[PDB]
């Protein structure tokens, strides 16, 4: 799976309306290839340090993988 | 999940 690691500054997504809570987030790559990119997405920068959840079914009520991790 |  992706894993990613975020670092300064980096845009991180997550989904109003799959995320099971707000910690749960993507990288840019897992979001734009994501369903999460025709929803009600948030986009926030990252301070640095966590991870991309992209494959984690306990993160994403639906769509927990990517077109590339999939 | 972010930083924690
Ligand atoms: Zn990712
Ligand atoms: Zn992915
Ligand atoms: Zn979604």
């Given at each position: 799976?992706?894993?990613?690691?975020?670092?300064?500054?980096?845009?991180?997504?997550?989904?109003?309306?799959?995320?099971?809570?707000?910690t749960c987030v993507?990288?840019?790559?897992?979001?734009?290839?994501?369903?999460?990119?025709?929803?009600?997405?948030?986009?926030?920068?990252?301070?640095?340090?966590g991870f991309?959840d992209?494959?984690?079914?306990?993160?994403?009520?639906?769509?927990?993988?990517?077109?590339?991790?999939? | 999940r972010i930083?924690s």
């Open positions: 799976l992706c894993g990613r690691v975020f670092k300064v500054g980096e845009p991180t997504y997550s989904c109003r309306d799959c995320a099971v809570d707000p993507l990288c840019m790559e897992c979001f734009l290839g994501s369903i999460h990119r025709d929803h009600r997405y948030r986009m926030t920068t990252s301070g640095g340090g991309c992209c494959g984690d079914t306990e993160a994403w009520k639906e769509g927990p993988y990517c077109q590339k991790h999939e | 930083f």
